[PDB]
Amino acid sequence: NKCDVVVVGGGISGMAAAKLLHDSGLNVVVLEARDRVGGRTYTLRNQKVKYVDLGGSYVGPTQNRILRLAKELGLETYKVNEVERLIHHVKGKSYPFRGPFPPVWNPITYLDHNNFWRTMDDMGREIPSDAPWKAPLAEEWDNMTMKELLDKLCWTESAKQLATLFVNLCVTAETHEVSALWFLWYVKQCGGTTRIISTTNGGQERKFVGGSGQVSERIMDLLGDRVKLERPVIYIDQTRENVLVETLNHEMYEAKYVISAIPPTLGMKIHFNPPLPMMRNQMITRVPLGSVIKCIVYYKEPFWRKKDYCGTMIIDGEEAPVAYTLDDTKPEGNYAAIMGFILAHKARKLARLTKEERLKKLCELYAKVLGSLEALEPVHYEEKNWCEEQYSGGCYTTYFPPGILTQYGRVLRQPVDRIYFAGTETATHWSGYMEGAVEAGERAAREILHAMGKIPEDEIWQSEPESVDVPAQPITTTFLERHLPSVPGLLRLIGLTTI
Amino acid sequence: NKCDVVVVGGGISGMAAAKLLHDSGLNVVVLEARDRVGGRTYTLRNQKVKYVDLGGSYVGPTQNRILRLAKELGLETYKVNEVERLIHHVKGKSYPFRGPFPPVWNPITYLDHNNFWRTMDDMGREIPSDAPWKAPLAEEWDNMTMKELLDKLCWTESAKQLATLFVNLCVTAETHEVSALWFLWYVKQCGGTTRIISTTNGGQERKFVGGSGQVSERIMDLLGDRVKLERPVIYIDQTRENVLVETLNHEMYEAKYVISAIPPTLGMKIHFNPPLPMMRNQMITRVPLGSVIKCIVYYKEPFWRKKDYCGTMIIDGEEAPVAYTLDDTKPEGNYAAIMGFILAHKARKLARLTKEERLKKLCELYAKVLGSLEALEPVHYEEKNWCEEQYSGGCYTTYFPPGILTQYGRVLRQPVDRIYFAGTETATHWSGYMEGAVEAGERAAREILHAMGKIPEDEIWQSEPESVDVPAQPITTTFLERHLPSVPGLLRLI
Ligand SMILES: *Cc1cc2c(cc1C)nc1c(=O)[nH]c(=O)nc-1n2C[C@H](O)[C@H](O)[C@H](O)COP(=O)(O)OP(=O)(O)OC[C@H]1O[C@@H](n2cnc3c(N)ncnc32)[C@H](O)[C@@H]1O
Ligand SMILES: *Cc1cc2c(cc1C)nc1c(=O)[nH]c(=O)nc-1n2C[C@H](O)[C@H](O)[C@H](O)COP(=O)(O)OP(=O)(O)OC[C@H]1O[C@@H](n2cnc3c(N)ncnc32)[C@H](O)[C@@H]1O
Ligand SMILES: NS(=O)(=O)Cc1noc2ccccc12
Ligand SMILES: NS(=O)(=O)Cc1noc2ccccc12
């Protein structure tokens, strides 16, 4: 029944919020729909794999909030394998390389690739992290899809193809599905193209020893009986002095304030009294989550390392079920494994198959890309299709279709009377990620502390000290990268000389 | 507790389904979230207006199901006033005209406008009404917004602006918000451009005497206490022998089958056991409804008729709050009124204002367009902003953003175990309209009759005889309309 704050959702965001409030001396309850905490993070444990992240997994430099939270909880990280060569597979052939970006030899194509990434970041700098709708050309950019933007920007098929894979991989959506403004924001608020795509010095640098599900699990341990499992919230009533929150299993909770720590669209599963204001009422029907199946194929040994491949594969082509892989071998060197993502339309397409049929297709793909018959000899397989999850809606995160972010974006984290909004989607730095979940949960909690008169306004948003364990190398460019012309820029130079 | 079929939603679709099953001898229950029936139709009564439709209102030729159902319930129609001239207001000036399409005089603009409408219908002929995802170019057209298609097709700003207004008015959404495939299907499944945009001989020909709300109300009258108001459904359990349906007010209903007669996305408000299949789980997060405020300004007399204007105004440009109006005067000539729609982003923008502030803006606009100071003296005002409705999600209907119809369209009316799907969004003819609501409700009911072995498979979909009261006249084109070149076509001849 009675408490100070009800937190709806026991993912990382809700758990971070609840922990902050609890540490501050408030009486909190977490109402979680599932029989587990963690949400879009889920660490499976069994004898064949020991542990494996089937949801969110990677952390990296500049993600200082998740690193600090996890450290405080007693967790350690380890580095994802990137010792050996990466592979870019294009038009049925594999091209090994080093560094974050697949190399390009053709001079025209090089100019086009260089300009593409540069332009993504150039446009990003126009977009405020905390208010993307305030970009000078917000409306123009929001009214085109990423497909349209790539069609304008990429003068080569090679760049367009790689850029398409980049979009699919980052946001588990097709280029024609998403707003250009929103995607440009999404990349910029992660620190830009280099930071978001990189393993070493980027978002995919590390994993947690024992899995990311431990973050939510250990917070549940600290909170004890305050976390209520299998309590899906169905109804929130703010007409009276205290907020009333009802669950599906017929329980009533009474609170001063509520934090909604669920994906924005999943707010639809709750009936509101009084009704939500118009803008939020419509916003939550306009913000779908992407589509992905995370697949892990296990092997006797990490055989790819012997061929001087680290296990990273960037795989372009409609035929390929998986467009991106990483080595998922344990830091001890055992439970050898390749993690792969089946993205966007392919997640829909290949969901029809059996688990065994997907495993077969993945092994045949990996065998070709790695030029290795050993890839046809898996010892185990695990997968999770996040599209089937009633209480997630998809993965990794919420995307915005054309026109939505400028029209409805401002209400994402606008409080509704005594309801405050957390969830990674409401973050301003690494929104979409575990990092964003922590930022949003702690910010929502502090909004409530401010409303109660416990902290001053300037303490709602708080900076985070850089991790001493995971230092961030700055993102740098070369003179040539900065000043080489685009393809149309070069054509202009040609036309002017011929005058 | 126990019945044969639970119908979720007491709009026209839910009511039509429940009536059909009831008339077949089954025990039905309608569970309705609101304290009223009708859903996206709502007729307000007071002394000042007598009655006014604040939701869906118009019916016309080829909408034979809604006309038949209404007639059976004892309703009659009257004609929307289109005796005098229509107005197209462009670049701050009113241009009166007759016929469905505003005329264009510049020869280049003429070719461009002609080609736009013609191309819309040309593309539509390749889109199956019952399976738009089966169009030969389904993926190409679905991966494009209407904004992109218009940018490609329209060589003049004039055609592009009118095309844009057309999209905004038809589907209460911006051209950049909606899939080209879906929009082309939408127009085609209403019978094409002329049929959808026409008052005389089209969708806006008629209104119901006493209001469209009477359709749902009179079915509720028939069903009596089988309709349960203020029963929002929260939970559907299909794990046992009988389907269990729970409401927010704690009641439990048990049935052999369920009809979901709510907008697809409002399916999100229900917790499912077992969970929905993946495709429907994601589909219902991908399908928003449009944005509109319906506004009716009342006057002492239908003064526009004195200047040989019928009251229809097509008003281009960002500045105008309302882009389209119709005469809403009653058949007797009293309760003189102009109905206007505030569409899409303008509904979002102008919702911030007070009711009185919106009235002033509309009156000043109408004064300019009609060229009459009489527009500045309203006697009454009614409005409804459908964006604020928890149990609608918007109006008029659900739109599909780029990429969604091809990926998820097929699951719209695919049954989920013992749940069948009604609602105008699942119709194949006038989906989005009251007509589509009737089609889908009766089809879903007949799917259940077939599942029970009461009727054969070929009786699930049923043709409708043409209304005797509202017969359809054929849509025609002229030789020149069919064969005049596009702008780039004329350029290739140069
Ligand atoms: C799924 C996924 C996610 C992911 C990714 C790969 C996949 C396959 N890779 C990531 C990565 O490598 N690194 C990273 O930092 N993030 C990655 N992501 C995304 C990440 O998992 C998410 O950003 C993060 O987990 C989100 O946390 P948040 O707390 O904001 O949100 P949530 O996990 O979805 O938790 C919400 C909880 O609420 C419960 N719920 C839902 N509805 C209700 C109702 N009505 N009542 C009560 N509880 C409700 C959910 O069950 C959930 O626990
Ligand atoms: C709003 C609007 C609609 C409209 C239009 C102009 C406006 C402003 N003009 C139209 C017109 O001139 N001619 C026409 O034929 N249609 C026009 N439209 C659209 C039309 O009103 C709709 O197509 C039609 O009314 C839709 O009917 P349908 O039966 O398919 O759907 P509904 O009216 O939305 O009814 C659904 C009912 O379900 C209830 N509900 C929602 N959730 C629940 C839950 N969880 N549990 C129980 N009941 C639920 C709703 O409250 C509603 O009553
Ligand atoms: N963090 S992850 O690998 O689970 C998904 C992901 N988001 O953005 C990326 C950019 C490049 C490679 C992967 C990703
Ligand atoms: N049926 S209505 O008037 O409520 C909305 C409507 N849909 O498509 C149209 C085309 C021209 C004018 C109006 C409309």
Q: Which residues of A touch B265 (CB under 8 A)?
A: 268, 285
Fill in the DSSP letter of residue A277: P
The CA distances from residue B298 to B233, B295, B362, B377, in Å, are 38, 10, 11, 9
CA distance B405 to A356: 29
What approach was used to elucidate this structure? Answer: X-ray
**Phi–psi pair at B261, nearest 5 degrees:** -115, 40
- Phi-psi map region of A110: left, alpha, beta (phi>0 left; psi -120 to 50 alpha): alpha
CA distance B9 to B37: 8
Residue A129: both structure tokens together:
């992290």
Closest CA to A14 of A465, A443, A430: A443
Please classify residue B52 by burial: count the beta carbons closer than 10 Å to its beta carbon, then call 0-12 exposed, 13-18 middle and 19+ buried.
buried
Q: How far is A212 from chain B (nearest CA, A)?
A: 25
Interface of B with A in 395-434 (CB under 8 A): 401-404, 407
CATH topology of domain B1-39+61-76+209-287+401-461: FAD/NAD(P)-binding domain (3.50.50)
What is the residue with the minimal CA distance to atom 25 of ligand 1? A40
Using a 6 Å cutoff on CB, does residue A141 contact ligand 3? no
Strands B292-298 and B380-385: antiparallel
CA of A430 to the centre of ligand 1 (A): 14
Q: Count other C-beta atoms under 10 Å from residue A287's C-beta.
A: 27
Q: Under a CB-based contact definition with an 8 Å cutoff, are residues A280 and A385 in contact?
A: no
CA distance A432 to A425: 6
Do the two domains B40-60+77-105+198-208+288-400 and B106-197 of this chain adopt the same fold? no
The CA distances from residue A37 to A23, A287, A430, in Å, are 19, 23, 21
Question: Side chain identity at A481, as an amino acid letter?
Answer: E
Per-residue b or e along A20-53, where b marks 16 or more CB atoms closer than 10 Å to that residue's CB? bbbebebebbbbbbbebbbbbbbbbeeeebebbb
Q: Count other C-beta atoms under 10 Å from residue B368's C-beta.
A: 16
**Structural Rg of chain A based on CA atoms:** 23
CA atoms within 13 A on the CB side of B491: 6
Contact between B232 and A271 using a beta-carbon 8 Å cutoff: yes
- Best B176, B279, B280, B348 member to test A by mutation, with max A CBs in 10 Å, is B176
CA distance B354 to B360: 10
Q: Count other C-beta atoms under 10 Å from residue A316's C-beta.
A: 17
| Secondary structure of A74-107 in HEC code, one letter for each residue | CCCEEECCCCCEEEEEECCEEEEECCCCCCCCCH
CA distance A267 to A318: 35
Fill in the DSSP letter of residue A145: B
Q: Where are the alpha helices (DSSP H) in A6-95?
A: 12-23, 64-72
Closest CA to B486 of B85, B13, B97, B152: B152
Beta bridge partners of A207: A78
Question: Side chain identity at B203, as an amino acid letter?
Answer: G
Contact between B176 and A143 using a beta-carbon 8 Å cutoff: yes
Residue A402: both structure tokens together:
């054309």
A157 near B CB under 8 A? no
Using a 6 Å cutoff on CB, does residue A203 contact ligand 3? yes
Q: Count other C-beta atoms under 10 Å from residue B110's C-beta.
A: 18
CA distance A71 to A208: 10
Beta-carbon contacts of B19 under 8 Å, excluding residues fewer than 6 positions away, are B219, B222, B223
- Total residue length of chain B: 494
Residue A271: both structure tokens together:
């009936």
CA distance B324 to B111: 24
CA distance B141 to B123: 10
Beta bridge partners of A309: A85
CA distance A124 to A259: 30
**Structural Rg of chain B based on CA atoms:** 23
Q: Under a CB-based contact definition with an 8 Å cutoff, are residues A334 and A121 in contact?
A: no
Residue A447: both structure tokens together:
């909004």
Closest CA to A455 of A4, A20, A29: A20
CA distance B61 to B432: 16
Instruction: Determine the longest span between alpha carbons in chain B, in angstroms.
Output: 75
CA distance B270 to B260: 11
**Residue with token string 């985070």:** A464
CA distance B155 to B29: 55
CA atoms within 13 A on the CB side of A346: 24
Q: What counts of helices (H) and strands (E) characterise chain A?
A: 16, 20
CA of B421 to the centre of ligand 2 (A): 14
Closest CA to A51 of A75, A19, A84: A75
CA atoms within 13 A on the CB side of A239: 6
Using a 6 Å cutoff on CB, does residue A127 contact ligand 3? no
Fill in the DSSP letter of residue A32: E
Question: Side chain identity at B195, as an amino acid letter?
Answer: R
CA distance A102 to A89: 10
Q: Which residues of B touch A277 (CB under 8 A)?
A: 388
CA distance B434 to B219: 14
CA angle A450, A452, A455 (to 5 degrees): 35
B388 near A CB under 8 A? yes
Question: Side chain identity at B16, as an amino acid letter?
Answer: A
Please classify residue B441 by burial: count the beta carbons closer than 10 Å to its beta carbon, then call 0-12 exposed, 13-18 middle and 19+ buried.
buried
Residue B415: both structure tokens together:
């049954």
CA of A386 to the centre of ligand 1 (A): 10
**Phi–psi pair at B477, nearest 5 degrees:** -130, 160
What is the residue with the minimal CA distance to atom 8 of ligand 2? B55
| Secondary structure of A343-394 in HEC code, one letter for each residue | ECHHHHHHCCCCHHHHHHHHHHHHHHHHCCHHHHCCCEEEEEEHHHCCCCCC
Q: How far is A69 from chain B (nearest CA, A)?
A: 32
Q: Under a CB-based contact definition with an 8 Å cutoff, are residues A51 and A214 in contact?
A: no
Q: Under a CB-based contact definition with an 8 Å cutoff, are residues B391 and B230 in contact?
A: no
Using a 6 Å cutoff on CB, does residue A392 contact ligand 1? yes
Q: Count other C-beta atoms under 10 Å from residue B115's C-beta.
A: 23
CATH code for the part of the protein at A40-60+77-105+198-208+288-400:
3.90.660.10
Beta bridge partners of A2: A254
Cα-Cα-Cα-Cα dihedral of B30, B32, B38, B44, to 10°? 140
CATH code for the part of the protein at A106-197:
1.10.405.10
Q: Under a CB-based contact definition with an 8 Å cutoff, are residues A265 and A322 in contact?
A: no
The resolution in Å comes to: 1.8
Q: Count other C-beta atoms under 10 Å from residue A356's C-beta.
A: 9
Atom from ligand 4 closest to the CA of residue B56? 4
Domain ranges for chain A: 1-39+61-76+209-287+401-461, 40-60+77-105+198-208+288-400, 106-197
**Phi–psi pair at A289, nearest 5 degrees:** -100, 155
Beta bridge partners of B300: none
CA distance A351 to A388: 10
Q: What angle, 0 to 180 degrees and rounded to 10, lies between the N-to-C axes of helices B107-124 and B180-188?
A: 80
Q: Under a CB-based contact definition with an 8 Å cutoff, are residues B404 and B275 in contact?
A: no
CA atoms within 13 A on the CB side of A372: 21
- Phi-psi map region of B64: left, alpha, beta (phi>0 left; psi -120 to 50 alpha): alpha
**Residue with token string 């994402």:** A412
Q: Count other C-beta atoms under 10 Å from residue B256's C-beta.
A: 18
CA distance B103 to B87: 10
CA distance B2 to B10: 19
Element (H, E) at A114: helix A107-124
Q: What angle, 0 to 180 degrees and rounded to 10, lies between the N-to-C axes of helices A107-124 and A487-497?
A: 120
- Best A268, A269, A391 member to test B by mutation, with max B CBs in 10 Å, is A268
CA of B16 to the centre of ligand 4 (A): 23
Element (H, E) at A311: strand A309-315
The CA distances from residue A8 to A34, A419, B266, B365, in Å, are 12, 10, 20, 47
B176 near A CB under 8 A? yes
CA distance B136 to B123: 10
Q: How far is A255 from chain B (nearest CA, A)?
A: 20
CA angle B457, B462, B465 (to 5 degrees): 160
Interface of A with B in 203-262 (CB under 8 A): 232, 234-235, 248, 250
The CA distances from residue A135 to A75, A142, A266, A342, B5, in Å, are 39, 10, 28, 33, 52
Question: Taking the mean position of all CA atoms in its chain, how far away is CA A103?
Answer: 26
Beta-carbon contacts of B455 under 8 Å, excluding residues fewer than 6 positions away, are B446, B449
Q: Under a CB-based contact definition with an 8 Å cutoff, are residues A56 and A433 in contact?
A: yes
Q: Under a CB-based contact definition with an 8 Å cutoff, are residues B250 and B233 in contact?
A: no
Element (H, E) at A447: helix A434-451
Q: Which residues of B touch A404 (CB under 8 A)?
A: 177
| Secondary structure of chain B in HEC code, one letter for each residue | CECCEEEECCEHHHHHHHHHHHHCCCCEEEEECCCCCECCCCEEEECCCEEEECCCCEECCCCHHHHHHHHHCCCCEEECCCCCEEEEEECCEEEEECCCCCCCCCHHHHHHHHHHHHHHHHHHCCCCCCCHHHCCCHHHHHCCEHHHHHHHHCCCHHHHHHHHHHHHHHHCCCCCCCEHHHHHHHHHCCCCHHHHHCCCCCCCCEEECCCCHHHHHHHHHHHHHHEEECCCEEEEECCCCCEEEEECCCCEEEECEEEECCCHHHHHHCEEECCCCHHHHHHCCCCCECCEEEEEEECCCCHHHHHCEEEEEEECCCCCCCCEEEECCCCCCCCCEEEEEEECHHHHHHCCCCHHHHHHHHHHHHHHHHCCHHHHCCCEEEEEEHHHCCCCCCCCCECCCCCHHHHHHHHCCCCECCEEECCHHHCCCCCCCHHHHHHHHHHHHHHHHHHCCCCCHHHCCCCCCCCCCCCCCCCCCCHHHHHCCCHHHHHHCC
Q: Under a CB-based contact definition with an 8 Å cutoff, are residues A261 and A306 in contact?
A: no
Beta-carbon contacts of B438 under 8 Å, excluding residues fewer than 6 positions away, are B12, B13, B16, B65, B66, B69
Residue B1: both structure tokens together:
């507790």
Strands A85-90 and A309-315: parallel
Q: How far is B43 from chain A (nearest CA, A)?
A: 21
Fill in the DSSP letter of residue A327: E
Closest CA to A368 of A90, A170, A117, A173: A90
CA distance A9 to A6: 9
Strands B271-273 and B233-237: parallel
What is the residue with the minimal CA distance to atom 9 of ligand 3? A170
What is the residue with the minimal CA distance to atom 24 of ligand 2? B434
CA of B240 to the centre of ligand 4 (A): 45
CA of A40 to the centre of ligand 1 (A): 3
Fill in the DSSP letter of residue A398: B
Fill in the DSSP letter of residue A11: B
Interface of A with B in 49-108 (CB under 8 A): none
Beta-carbon contacts of A100 under 8 Å, excluding residues fewer than 6 positions away, are A194, A197, A198, A199, A200, A201, A202
Question: Taking the mean position of all CA atoms in its chain, how far away is CA B191?
Answer: 14
The CA distances from residue A80 to A205, A218, A361, B215, B358, in Å, are 6, 23, 25, 64, 59
